[PDB]
Amino acid sequence: EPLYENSPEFTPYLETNLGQPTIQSFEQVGTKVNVTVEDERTLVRRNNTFLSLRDVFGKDLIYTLYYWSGKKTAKTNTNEFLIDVDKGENYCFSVQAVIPSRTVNRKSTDSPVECM
Amino acid sequence: TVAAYNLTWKSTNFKTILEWEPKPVNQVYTVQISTKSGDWKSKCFYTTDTECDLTDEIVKDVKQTYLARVFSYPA
Amino acid sequence: IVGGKVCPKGECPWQVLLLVNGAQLCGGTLINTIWVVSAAHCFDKIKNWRNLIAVLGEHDLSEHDGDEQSRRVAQVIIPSTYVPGTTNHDIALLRLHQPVVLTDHVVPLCLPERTFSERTLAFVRFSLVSGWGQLLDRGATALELMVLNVPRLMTQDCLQQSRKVGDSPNITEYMFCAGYSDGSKDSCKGDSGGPHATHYRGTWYLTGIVSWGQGCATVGHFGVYTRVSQYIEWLQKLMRSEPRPGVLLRAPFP
Amino acid sequence: ANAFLEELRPGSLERECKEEQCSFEEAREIFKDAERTKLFWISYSDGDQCASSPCQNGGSCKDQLQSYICFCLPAFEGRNCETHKDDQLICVNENGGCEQYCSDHTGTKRSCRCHEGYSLLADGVSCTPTVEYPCGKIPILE
Numbered sequence: 213e214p215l216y217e218n219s220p221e222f223t224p225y226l227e228t229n230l231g232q233p234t235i236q237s238f239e240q241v242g243t244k245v246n247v248t249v250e251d252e253r254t255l256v257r258r259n260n261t262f263l264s265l266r267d268v269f270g271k272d273l274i275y276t277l278y279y280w281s282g283k284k285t286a287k288t289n290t291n292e293f294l295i296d297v298d299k300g301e302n303y304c305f306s307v308q309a310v311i312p313s314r315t316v317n318r319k320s321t322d323s324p325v326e327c328m
Numbered sequence: 329t330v331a332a333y334n335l336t337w338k339s340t341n342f343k344t345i346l347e348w349e350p351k352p353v354n355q356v357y358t359v360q361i362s363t364k365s366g367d368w369k370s371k372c373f374y375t376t377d378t379e380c381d382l383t384d385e386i387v388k389d390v391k392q393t394y395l396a397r398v399f400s401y402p403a
Numbered sequence: 404i405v406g407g408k409v410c411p412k413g414e415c416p417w418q419v420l421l422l423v424n425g426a427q428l429c430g431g432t433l434i435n436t437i438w439v440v441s442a443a444h445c446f447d448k449i450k451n452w453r454n455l456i457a458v459l460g461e462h463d464l465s466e467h468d469g470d471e472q473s474r475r476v477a478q479v480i481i482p483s484t485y486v487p488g489t490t491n492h493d494i495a496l497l498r499l500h501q502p503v504v505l506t507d508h509v510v511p512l513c514l515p516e517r518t519f520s521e522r523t524l525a526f527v528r529f530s531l532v533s534g535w536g537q538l539l540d541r542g543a544t545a546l547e548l549m550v551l552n553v554p555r556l557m558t559q560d561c562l563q564q565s566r567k568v569g570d571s572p573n574i575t576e577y578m579f580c581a582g583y584s585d586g587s588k589d590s591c592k593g594d595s596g597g598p599h600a601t602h603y604r605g606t607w608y609l610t611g612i613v614s615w616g617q618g619c620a621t622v623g624h625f626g627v628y629t630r631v632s633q634y635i636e637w638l639q640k641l642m643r644s645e646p647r648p649g650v651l652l653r654a655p656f657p
Numbered sequence: 658a659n660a661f662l663e664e665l666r667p668g669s670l671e672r673e674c675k676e677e678q679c680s681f682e683e684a685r686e687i688f689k690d691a692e693r694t695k696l697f698w699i700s701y702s703d704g705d706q707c708a709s710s711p712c713q714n715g716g717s718c719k720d721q722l723q724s725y726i727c728f729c730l731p732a733f734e735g736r737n738c739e740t741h742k743d744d745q746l747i748c749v750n751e752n753g754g755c756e757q758y759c760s761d762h763t764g765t766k767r768s769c770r771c772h773e774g775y776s777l778l779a780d781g782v783s784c785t786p787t788v789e790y791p792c793g794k795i796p797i798l799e
């Protein structure tokens with residue numbers, strides 16, 4: 213038998229890093245603003261088609277929103293946020309993918325920033 | 329020949345790549361991956377690269393736990 | 404066999420039971436109508452070479468049914484490199500004086516080509532080992548054929564996972580480990596010479612021979628099997644050899 | 658970017674950074690907060706590793722921090738989708754799809770064979786019994 217070396221064990225669902233998300237859009241509906249996170253596709257395929265991170269984690273995944281004199285955070289079980297905003301003010305946004313149950317690598321890098 | 333060392337898992341959104349050292353000098357590599365009770369599957373056959381995409385094997389069941397092994401072959 | 408299950412009648416059709424002067428000697432594996440592969444160490448204390456019997460289609464030693472077939476063993480071939488009292492080259496090729504009749508309860512296990520066995524069968528995780536051996540390290544032997552599923556390990560892992568022991572035999576290239584180190588399942592004394600059969604895409608093949616091990620199912624240890632892949636060429640040539648005067652034949656290896 | 662007479666223009670992240678390219682001070686210089694600035698600067702100044710279109714054979718690139726991810730078409734794999742799955746029909750790869758024996762042949766397609774007692778089917782990879790009791794099969798279960 214040839215010389216070889218074993219790798220550490222690897223459990224995808226628990227260790228794979230969460231990718232950088234991107235804010236798909238944001239609009240005002242009166243005094244509130246909606247922030248939509250783009251579906252983050254993965255390498256997992258479900259019969260000719262890449263599944264989104266939510267398709268894979270479902271409830272195991274949440275998205276956090278940073279908006280703004282500190283910061284204001286918001287969290288969602290979907291890919292959308294509906295926040296309260298002061299009229300006449302322009303806010304900026306940044307989202308982060310999160311899997312709360314994880315102790316390490318529980319969060320992805322922040323998405324690019326977008327402002328009204 | 330020398331055994332590969334520093335095997336590291338590089339994975340983001342399930343695109344999973346195993347990396348290792350060192351640069352191959354008069355030797356090639358072949359990777360095998362398996363689940364605790366499953367058979368060993370070979371990948372990146374006699375490659376001279378120091379990494380191996382194992383994405384197509386882990387996405388078969390992301391909740392399973394896999395173990396990989398890096399063989400060193402002379403020539 | 405320790406921690407296994409009874410092999411349903413007819414489901415271990417290639418299993419052979421060897422007898423010397425009527426008493427249980429070892430297990431064996433039928434590979435065609437006239438040849439049986441077993442372990443060399445099984446014949447270390449044999450004195451009556453003409454009283455060797457191979458029984459095919461056996462299941463329950465406490466009773467006889469019309470499926471059992473017995474054949475006198477005409478020749479016992481072992482590698483000249485094998486040293487009695489030791490563990491290396493623990494293999495034996497047996498020639499039956501008359502072929503057995505293949506039936507629903509008597510079927511040979513396929514002897515594979517060397518390459519196919521080294522690059523394909525060697526990586527199939529589980530394989531089955533069987534016999535009428537001891538049910539517990541020091542216990543009694545089994546009356547009904549026992550079979551067990553065991554996972555194979557590359558030698559490096561076997562060594563790193565086994566509890567260091569004083570003057571334990573070396574695990575050569577002519578051997579390989581399989582089993583569990585948690586003291587729950589393993590082949591055992593009396594199972595020696597029996598098959599380690601690997602299932603692959605609809606066909607079973609002979610990959611190992613029950614050979615030795617630290618006690619039976621001992622924590623920190625794995626069962627050790629003769630690596631059949633290393634003797635494919637040796638076995639084929641000899642099966643084409645002409646019979647000789649004496650029973651025992653110490654044939655050169657390679 | 659600033660060129661006298663576009664200075665008069667009041668601060669603008671759009672202008673500014675999206676627009677033209679800006680410096681950390683310039684984001685400074687709009688966000689005020691340290692914190693908030695870095696947050697923005699984290700991605701903004703990381704670069705688009707996908708600009709070099711690294712994903713081959715019709716693959717799709719997705720930027721990440723200091724890296725990227727390639728989404729390959731079904732017939733490819735590898736960090737950059739360079740590996741053609743169709744060029745992997747060798748015996749070491751799952752026995753070359755052979756049911757029993759496999760033989761590699763450089764310059765030509767690998768070939769499959771069978772143990773005595775069996776014969777290769779027209780599909781070039783399957784083996785079927787040629788006798789009543791072939792080796793390696795269990796009658797009471799067949």
Ligand SMILES: C=Cc1ccc(-c2ccc(C(=O)NCC(C)C)cc2C(=O)O)c(CNc2ccc(C(=N)N)cn2)c1
Binds near residue numbers: 490592617627
């Ligand atoms: C390879 C040398 C060798 C020589 C003699 C014996 C030997 C010594 C004594 C007895 C004995 O006390 N007979 C009593 C009763 C069973 C009739 C039987 C055997 C034998 O050949 O099996 C063994 C033992 N073989 C194995 C095989 C597998 C394992 C394992 N844990 N996987 C452990 N021991 C090995």
Ligand SMILES: OC[C@H]1OC[C@@H](O)[C@@H](O)[C@H]1O
Binds near residue numbers: 705707709710711
């Ligand atoms: O942009 C980053 C990429 O650039 C081109 C690719 O071939 C590879 O070098 C990767 O590093």
Ligand SMILES: [Ca+2]
Binds near residue numbers: 462463464465
């Ligand atoms: Ca009987």
Ligand SMILES: [Ca+2]
Binds near residue numbers: 658659673683
């Ligand atoms: Ca400016």
Ligand SMILES: [Ca+2]
Binds near residue numbers: 659
């Ligand atoms: Ca300036």
Ligand SMILES: [Ca+2]
Binds near residue numbers: 660663
């Ligand atoms: Ca200008």
Ligand SMILES: [Ca+2]
Binds near residue numbers: 666
């Ligand atoms: Ca300006």
Ligand SMILES: [Ca+2]
Binds near residue numbers: 671676
């Ligand atoms: Ca604009």
Ligand SMILES: [Ca+2]
Binds near residue numbers: 676
């Ligand atoms: Ca502009």
Ligand SMILES: [Ca+2]
């Ligand atoms: Ca200034």
Ligand SMILES: [Ca+2]
Binds near residue numbers: 705722723
């Ligand atoms: Ca980037």
